[PDB]
Scaffold this active site. Structure first.
Site, PDB file in Angstrom:
ATOM      1  N   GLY A  52       0.933  -1.142   0.018  1.00  0.00           N
ATOM      2  CA  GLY A  52       0.006  -0.136   0.096  1.00  0.00           C
ATOM      3  C   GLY A  52       0.833   1.232  -0.023  1.00  0.00           C
ATOM      4  N   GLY A  64       2.053   2.750  -2.588  1.00  0.00           N
ATOM      5  CA  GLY A  64       1.742   3.705  -3.864  1.00  0.00           C
ATOM      6  C   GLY A  64       2.807   3.539  -4.898  1.00  0.00           C
ATOM      7  CE  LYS A  65       4.825  -1.907  -3.929  1.00  0.00           C
ATOM      8  NZ  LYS A  65       4.147  -1.795  -2.703  1.00  0.00           N
ATOM      9  CB  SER A  66       0.735  -0.086  -8.887  1.00  0.00           C
ATOM     10  OG  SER A  66       1.062  -1.004  -8.347  1.00  0.00           O
ATOM     11  CE1 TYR A  67      -2.302   8.465  -7.795  1.00  0.00           C
ATOM     12  CE2 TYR A  67       0.089   9.019  -7.076  1.00  0.00           C
ATOM     13  CZ  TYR A  67      -1.254   9.473  -7.477  1.00  0.00           C
ATOM     14  OH  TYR A  67      -1.468  10.675  -7.323  1.00  0.00           O
ATOM     15  CG  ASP A  75       4.315  -1.654  -9.787  1.00  0.00           C
ATOM     16  OD1 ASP A  75       4.938  -1.141  -8.489  1.00  0.00           O
ATOM     17  OD2 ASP A  75       3.033  -1.533 -10.008  1.00  0.00           O
ATOM     18  N   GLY A  98       4.557  -5.450  -2.762  1.00  0.00           N
ATOM     19  CA  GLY A  98       5.069  -5.146  -1.215  1.00  0.00           C
ATOM     20  C   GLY A  98       5.067  -6.385  -0.575  1.00  0.00           C
TER      21      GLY A  98
HETATM   22  N1  LIG Z   1       0.605  10.486  -3.853  1.00  0.00           N
HETATM   23  C1  LIG Z   1      -0.697   9.895  -3.778  1.00  0.00           C
HETATM   24  N2  LIG Z   1      -1.786  10.406  -4.082  1.00  0.00           N
HETATM   25  C2  LIG Z   1      -2.909   9.794  -4.004  1.00  0.00           C
HETATM   26  N3  LIG Z   1      -3.132   8.663  -3.579  1.00  0.00           N
HETATM   27  C3  LIG Z   1      -1.983   7.765  -3.439  1.00  0.00           C
HETATM   28  C4  LIG Z   1      -0.884   8.322  -3.568  1.00  0.00           C
HETATM   29  N4  LIG Z   1      -0.126   7.191  -3.250  1.00  0.00           N
HETATM   30  C5  LIG Z   1      -0.626   6.314  -2.835  1.00  0.00           C
HETATM   31  N5  LIG Z   1      -1.949   6.660  -2.969  1.00  0.00           N
HETATM   32  C6  LIG Z   1      -3.031   5.611  -3.286  1.00  0.00           C
HETATM   33  O1  LIG Z   1      -2.544   4.204  -2.623  1.00  0.00           O
HETATM   34  C7  LIG Z   1      -3.385   3.362  -3.135  1.00  0.00           C
HETATM   35  C8  LIG Z   1      -2.446   1.996  -3.447  1.00  0.00           C
HETATM   36  O2  LIG Z   1      -1.467   2.312  -4.498  1.00  0.00           O
HETATM   37  P1  LIG Z   1      -0.693   1.192  -5.155  1.00  0.00           P
HETATM   38  O3  LIG Z   1       0.479   1.854  -6.277  1.00  0.00           O
HETATM   39  O4  LIG Z   1      -1.883   0.321  -5.705  1.00  0.00           O
HETATM   40  O5  LIG Z   1       0.042   0.470  -4.062  1.00  0.00           O
HETATM   41  P2  LIG Z   1       0.654  -1.058  -4.406  1.00  0.00           P
HETATM   42  O6  LIG Z   1       2.191  -0.591  -3.908  1.00  0.00           O
HETATM   43  O7  LIG Z   1       0.336  -2.074  -3.473  1.00  0.00           O
HETATM   44  O8  LIG Z   1       0.551  -1.147  -5.774  1.00  0.00           O
HETATM   45  C9  LIG Z   1      -3.836   3.881  -4.518  1.00  0.00           C
HETATM   46  O9  LIG Z   1      -5.381   3.507  -4.519  1.00  0.00           O
HETATM   47  C10 LIG Z   1      -3.801   5.334  -4.423  1.00  0.00           C
HETATM   48  O10 LIG Z   1      -4.967   5.959  -4.547  1.00  0.00           O
END
Ligand SMILES: Nc1ncnc2c1ncn2[C@@H]1O[C@H](COP(=O)(O)OP(=O)(O)O)[C@@H](O)[C@H]1O
Ligand SMILES: CC(=O)O[C@H]1C(=O)[C@@]2(C)[C@H]([C@H](OC(=O)c3ccccc3)[C@]3(O)C[C@H](OC(=O)[C@H](O)[C@@H](NC(=O)c4ccccc4)c4ccccc4)C(C)=C1C3(C)C)[C@]1(OC(C)=O)CO[C@@H]1C[C@@H]2O
Ligand SMILES: Nc1nc2c(ncn2[C@@H]2O[C@H](COP(=O)(O)OP(=O)(O)OP(=O)(O)O)[C@@H](O)[C@H]2O)c(=O)[nH]1
Ligand SMILES: Nc1nc2c(ncn2[C@@H]2O[C@H](COP(=O)(O)OP(=O)(O)O)[C@@H](O)[C@H]2O)c(=O)[nH]1
Ligand SMILES: [Mg+2]
Lengths: 429, 441, 368
Positions: free
Chosen positions: C98, C100-103, C251, C254
């Site tokens: 969680g 936010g790597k994929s984001y 990507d 976690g």
């Molecule tokens: N800088 C940010 N701004 C807005 N939302 C964020 C940010 N960073 C993370 N998130 C939130 O965190 C959630 C998970 O991000 P994701 O990249 O899917 O995590 P993971 O590492 O599990 O892939 C997303 O739904 C996103 O909305």
């Protein structure tokens, strides 16, 4: 209930396994008909480990027999303990691999392996709880090296959470028995390294020395060498069949012995071995076995552990003993010979003790060791390998069956990297 | 099960074959009438081993063999001899004319009119098998039949059957002794053709065995009924692992792999160490070591080629009888210690081993003695390039003047085929040199 | 090989989550600009870390706010510059569940990540330098790691109970590791890139968990291969000097504890596999950081498909950048500390990057 599948591939595995079932059948009181003629009751509580039961109080071994020639099999049927094997588990063909790894893996063995797996899938489902698999084969030939590693990949994918314990005869340093040993072993090691949990490296040259120096046998036949290996195969799984003070199993030995997923090649041993005429001159005590266990000259691996460092060893005892005499003695080895043991593992010794010894010995012992001196075995093959591959000595019989020159380079790099991964831990700085 | 077809071509083949099936029948307990009285006395057993003998329901055991001469004399000895009731009467004597020691006669002119029958009876024999392992062609360089007809046949079988081992057992022409003027031509012609189809050609020369029988068996004036009994034993050891029990069994595709590094250097030699008379069967131990060292003696080779002038590439040792493996390992090490025996740098292993528990049998009326253990060696050496050169020089001396050529053209051969076959043996002389050059970097 | 390119590390603090608002979590990560300070909530002990770059996406209106495009223009654009120069480039993410790597890498449709900006800027830069002397050739692939198996994301499956055809990895002596059978597609424009990316992300494996309702349960590698074919002043053939560059954007998944995201079966299995891969990656980073200090060290590349296929990026020959992603919640302070420790350990890595002229051992070698 813990259970094990035995698989016998080639001329080396079947000639061993036949003695393994000739040895195990003695501890459990089974006669060649499959009937029980024992004395004790501990011979039956855990008979389900290696055997299955039948209708008229008969016991069929859970063994599987595989080859590409019928000669190996007819010897079993025409032998002392031939009748007990399930005749529908003699799987074979014709036109053997010809000491070509390409023929056992891709061309011929591929047309027979599907029949082999169906026998495996039957036996495994007949078990309550599967613990692992037990393969006895040889490196240097085609069938054991090709058809074996083919089954290993398939069973591993089907049963990835179970143990794959593999007994393997490695090529000797001085005298070969085939010309293409390094090509076939390197390609097999490329598969075992990725698809096993513990594999015991046996070498026939060492077993000759054991029969020569200790047993004083100057005409030792293959029936005697396998009479040594079959003992070690029994000692490992003793604590799955008999009771003891401090139990152990295949998964517990693996966890302690194997620190990293790739360094699971071991140098086995067995005590107390002695001459028939020099048995009434020694006292059978625990310190007499430890001196015999950690002796450089009672290892079946053809590698000097004094040319390296022990990463972690194990010692499976059998009989009425005192656990102070066991743990105190394993400590004296570590502290005395501290240089042959890794510094970053404070206790390099796992132990296990069973209360039921062998048929005619007050007590016995089994030794399993992981050392950096196995470096010499994989390094030796690479020098043979590249010298032949640098000029393509015998390659045109492997490419002719559907192999490329690329697959040889992969087996070389992975073997050479393992050689360095073991050598990373020989220097103390 | 395992099943092999023995083919014998010409006179050098038949007179060897008559010695082989003499022996195969004894080891398995078969009388010359094809019967096996022991099995009806026993009530079981497959000692009538289906590798070499097929069995009918009437108890008669019929050998898996076809042999052909292109002259009727030598087969007619068999159709009227002591083994007439063993063989199938389909033996090819469609030999109203001989090949006159002409390749061009056994390859074309009378090379045909006979071959369609030969392929048919083989195809019948193969259709009776539950699996083949290869062929065994017994022939001789120098003749027209053993050179020409052998080549045409090896060509056709490589089409109909393809990937099946084809092991030749041929009489190599000797350097001094020879029974024909035009041997060099016939050898270079079929050697050119058989190279791309055969898998392993086991060489023997009649000049070496004359000396073996002299020095060891103490026969001062032998004939071909003696030379062909030793050759019968070399084959039994090769094919023993398909019939009898053993510790380290050796199939026919294992010689093809260990002794043939490159596809054009598949010309190994052979020998047989414990060749001793009945008297000298005493006074000696005949252990594994004493027998194994003899196989590397240059004087006990069944080919006249000093291996000390060359290097070894691969050596397959096939033991028989009361032999223990440690005795082999100790002995093979003693050989690698000796410095007169040089191996190529690219083959540090070198040795193959095979062991069997059935000892050799004694053909009564024979010269060989009864022993407990016996050994057959098969080796591939770079020394044999010297022998290829002798033939090529004889070729060139009498082809520079176009001698004896009009007898080959008179049959359909072109003048150019001689060159096309002399160039392929000049490439072979180099490949044997390129292999023997130790590597560098 | 006359260079030493230090691996460039960045850190990104994400904002509070729905979960971390439902649970009244505090703030424990702070910045003073370029440094990153972390505090245990017990007021016992403080730690500080320093990186080449640090981003602050905790709150939109705060000072120093590094939005998606700012993260791009700080990290990914120089990688495009080196890709046009002729170097291989790698950018890989790291962090706990969680974070936010994929984001940060791919993003959402209304907030495109690093990939849809990198490829677009690449095509745009090409449109200004597609002159008569030089032409360009672009291939793409996008592959997945799931339970230590390799899958292709840019194929349309069949229809069965099993339609994940696994490929295998191989080791070419010169080019290093690669994937056998991977569809490499020739591309023409950013719209085609976007179509392929949509297909791949729809094919990628996801699942609802206790920390991500749309979780990234498989490692993803996005490879671009760019070949610039230039022309010398020639009396003969034009278009006779080519330079290649591989861009790998990664990507990763976690850590994820099994007790927090309580779920049994396939979820647990793939979490275990993810954990194993991350452990091996950590070992690799530590071993390279120890190589940087002059010791003889062995890098366990072969213990996992991920590091095995990324052998040339974590070390080897390419210019590499790392993006650690962290959370300011106090409940995840331990995982934040582990991530930051591995990240600052990664700054000590040194890779030997070279230009892929494809002229060495041909003529430019002895020319110079
Ligand atoms: N800088 C940010 N701004 C807005 N939302 C964020 C940010 N960073 C993370 N998130 C939130 O965190 C959630 C998970 O991000 P994701 O990249 O899917 O995590 P993971 O590492 O599990 O892939 C997303 O739904 C996103 O909305
Ligand atoms: C009673 C007897 O005959 O005397 C001993 C004996 O003379 C010695 C030499 C035996 C004997 O050892 C050998 O002859 C031998 C030869 C080649 C290879 C291996 C062994 C013995 O065979 C060994 C055998 O030990 C066993 O039987 C164990 O159960 C053994 N299994 C078998 O030997 C066996 C029995 C029947 C059929 C097949 C095998 C065993 C070992 C490990 C795990 C389980 C079982 C015993 C007591 C002896 C003989 C028989 C002479 C010793 O063997 C062992 C197992 O260590 C050598 O030292 C021990 C004990 C004795 O000193
Ligand atoms: N060892 C051995 N060699 C033989 C025997 N008979 C003939 N040869 C060899 O055969 C060579 C000559 O070739 P042939 O075998 O006669 O040729 P062919 O196969 O009979 O063909 P034709 O001459 O046309 O009948 C000679 O050099 C002999 O050494 C034999 O019985 N034993
Ligand atoms: N210990 C032992 N090893 C054997 C025995 N028989 C064969 N071997 C080994 O097995 C190898 C032969 O390979 P093999 O599997 O028989 O070839 P294949 O028959 O074509 O499959 C050799 O390297 C021998 O060292 C035996 O009875 N005991
Ligand atoms: Mg004749």
């Amino acid at each position: 209930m813990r259970e094990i599948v035995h698989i016998q591939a080639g001329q080396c595995g079947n000639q061993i396994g036949a003695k393994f079932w000739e040895v195990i059948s003695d501890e459990h009181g089974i006669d060649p008909t499959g009937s029980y003629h024992g004395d004790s009751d501990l011979q039956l509580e855990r008979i389900n480990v290696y055997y299955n039961e039948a209708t008229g109080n008969k016991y069929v071994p859970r063994a599987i027999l595989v080859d590409l020639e019928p000669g190996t099999m007819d010897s079993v049927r025409s032998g002392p303990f031939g009748q007990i094997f399930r005749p529908d588990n003699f799987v074979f063909g014709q036109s053997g691999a010809g000491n070509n790894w390409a023929k056992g893996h891709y061309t011929e063995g591929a047309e027979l392996v599907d029949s082999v797996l169906d026998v495996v899938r039957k036996e495994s489902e007949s078990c309550d709880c599967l613990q692992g698999f037990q393969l006895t084969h040889s490196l240097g030939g085609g069938t054991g090296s090709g058809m074996g590693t083919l089954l290993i990949s398939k069973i591993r994918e089907e049963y990835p959470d179970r143990i794959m314990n593999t007994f393997s005869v490695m090529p000797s340093p001085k005298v070969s028995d085939t010309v293409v040993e390094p090509y076939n072993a390197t390609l097999s090691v490329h598969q075992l390294v990725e698809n096993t949990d513990e594999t015991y490296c046996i070498d026939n040259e060492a077993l000759y020395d054991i029969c020569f120096r200790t047993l004083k046998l100057t005409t030792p036949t293959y029936g005697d060498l396998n009479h040594l290996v079959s003992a070690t195969m029994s000692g490992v799984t003793t604590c799955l069949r008999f009771p003891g003070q401090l139990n152990a199993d295949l998964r517990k030995l693996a966890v302690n012995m194997v620190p990293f997923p790739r360094l699971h090649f071991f140098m086995p041993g067995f005590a107390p071995l002695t001459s028939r005429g020099s048995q009434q001159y020694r006292a059978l005590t625990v310190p007499e076995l430890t001196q015999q266990m950690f002796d450089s000259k009672n290892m079946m691996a053809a590698c000097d552990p004094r040319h390296g460092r022990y990463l972690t060893v194990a010692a499976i005892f059998r009989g009425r003993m005192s656990m102070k005499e066991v743990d105190e003695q394993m400590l004296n080895v570590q502290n005395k010979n501290s240089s042959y043991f890794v510094e970053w593992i404070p206790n390099n010794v796992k132990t296990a003790v069973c209360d039921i010894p062998p048929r005619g010995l007050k007590m016995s012992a089994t030794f399993i060791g992981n050392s950096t001196a196995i470096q010499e075995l994989f390094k030796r093959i690479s020098e043979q390998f590249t010298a032949m591959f640098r000029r393509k000595a015998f390659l045109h019989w492997y490419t002719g069956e559907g192999m490329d020159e690329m697959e040889f380079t992969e087996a070389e790099s992975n073997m050479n990297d393992l050689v360095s991964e073991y050598q990373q831990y020989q220097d103390a700085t | 099960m395992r099943e092999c077809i023995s083919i014998h071509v010409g006179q050098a083949g038949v007179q060897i074959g008559n010695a082989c099936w003499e022996l195969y029948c004894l080891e398995h307990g078969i009388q010359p009438d094809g019967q096996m009285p022991s099995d009806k006395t026993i009530g079981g057993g497959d000692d009538s081993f289906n590798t070499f003998f097929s069995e009918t329901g009437a108890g008669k055991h019929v050998p898996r063999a076809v042999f052909v001469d292109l002259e009727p004399t030598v087969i007619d000895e068999v159709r009227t001899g002591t083994y007439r009731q063993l063989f199938h009467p389909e033996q090819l004597i469609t030999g109203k004319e001989d090949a006159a020691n002409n390749y061009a006669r056994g390859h074309y002119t009378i090379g045909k009119e006979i071959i369609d029958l030969v392929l048919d009876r083989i195809r019948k024999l193969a259709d009776q098998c539950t699996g083949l392992q290869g062929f065994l062609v017994f022939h001789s360089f120098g003749g027209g039949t053993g050179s020409g007809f052998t080549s045409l046949l090896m060509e056709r079988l490589s089409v109909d059957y393809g990937k099946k081992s084809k092991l030749e057992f041929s009489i190599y022409p000797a350097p001094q002794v020879s029974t024909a003027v035009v041997e060099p031509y016939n050898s270079i012609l079929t050697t050119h053709t058989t190279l791309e189809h055969s898998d392993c050609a086991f060489m023997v020369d009649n000049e070496a065995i004359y000396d073996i029988c002299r020095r060891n068996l103490d026969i001062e004036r032998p004939t071909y009924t003696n030379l062909n009994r030793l050759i019968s034993q070399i084959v039994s050891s090769i094919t023993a692992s398909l019939r009898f029990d053993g510790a380290l069994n050796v199939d026919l595709t294992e010689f093809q792999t260990n002794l043939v590094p490159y596809p054009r250097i598949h010309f190994p030699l052979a020998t047989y160490a414990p060749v001793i008379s009945a008297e000298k069967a005493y006074h000696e131990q005949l252990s594994v070591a004493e027998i194994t060292n003899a196989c590397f003696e240059p004087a006990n080779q069944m080919v006249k080629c000093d291996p000390r002038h060359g290097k070894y590439m691969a050596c397959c040792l096939l033991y028989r009888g009361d032999v223990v493996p440690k005795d082999v390992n100790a002995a093979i090490a003693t050989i690698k210690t000796k410095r007169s025996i040089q191996f190529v740098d690219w083959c540090p292993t070198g040795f193959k081993v095979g062991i069997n528990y059935q000892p050799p049998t004694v053909v009564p009326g024979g010269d060989l003695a009864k022993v407990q253990r016996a050994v057959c060696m098969l080796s591939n050496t770079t020394a044999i390039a010297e022998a290829w050169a002798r033939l090529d020089h004889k070729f060139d001396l009498m082809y520079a003047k176009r001698a004896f050529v009009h007898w080959y053209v008179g049959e359909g051969m072109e003048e150019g085929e001689f060159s096309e076959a002399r160039e392929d043996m000049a490439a072979l002389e180099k490949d044997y040199e390129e292999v023997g050059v130790d590597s560098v970097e | 090989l006359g260079s030493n390119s230090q691996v460039t590390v960045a850190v990104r603090v994400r904002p509070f989550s729905k979960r971390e608002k439902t649970e009244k979590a505090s703030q424990v990560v702070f910045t003073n600009g370029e440094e990153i300070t972390v505090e245990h909530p017990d007021m016992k002990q403080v730690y500080s870390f320093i990186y080449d770059v640090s981003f602050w996406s905790f709150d939109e209106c705060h000072p120093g706010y590094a939005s998606q495009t700012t993260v791009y223009e700080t990290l990914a654009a120089p990688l495009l510059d080196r890709a046009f120069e002729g170097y291989n480039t790698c950018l890989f993410a790291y962090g706990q569940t969680g974070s936010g790597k994929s984001y940060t890498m791919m993003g959402l449709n209304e907030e495109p990540g690093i990939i849809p900006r990198f490829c677009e800027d690449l095509f745009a830069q090409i449109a200004k330098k597609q002159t008569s002397e030089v032409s360009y050739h672009l291939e793409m692939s996008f592959f997945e790691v799931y339970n230590e198996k390799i899958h292709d994301l840019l194929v349309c499956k069949g229809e069965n109970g099993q339609r994940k055809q696994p490929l295998r990895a191989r080791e070419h002596p010169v080019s290093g590791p690669y994937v056998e059978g991977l569809s490499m597609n020739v591309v023409s424009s950013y719209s085609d890139i976007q179509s392929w990316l949509e297909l791949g992300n729809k094919q990628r494996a996801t699942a609802a968990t206790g920390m991500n309702d749309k979780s990234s349960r498989s490692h993803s590698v996005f490879t671009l291969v760019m070949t610039q074919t230039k022309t010398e002043v020639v009396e003969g053939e034009e278009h006779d000097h080519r330079i290649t560059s591989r861009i790998n954007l990664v990507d990763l998944a976690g850590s994820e504890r099994c007790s927090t995201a309580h779920s049994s079966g396939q979820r647990l299995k793939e979490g275990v596999s993810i954990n194993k891969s991350l452990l091996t990656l950590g070992k690799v980073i530590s071993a390279l950081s120890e190589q940087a200090n002059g010791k003889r060290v062995f890098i366990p590349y072969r213990e996992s498909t991920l590091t095995w296929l990324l052998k040339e990026s974590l070390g080897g020959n390419s210019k590499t950048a790392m993006i650690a992603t962290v959370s300011p919640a106090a409940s995840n302070i331990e995982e934040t500390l582990s991530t930051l420790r591995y990240a600052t350990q990664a700054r000590l890595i040194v890779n030997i990057a070279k230009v892929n002229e494809d002229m060495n051992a041909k003529l430019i070698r002895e020319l110079k």
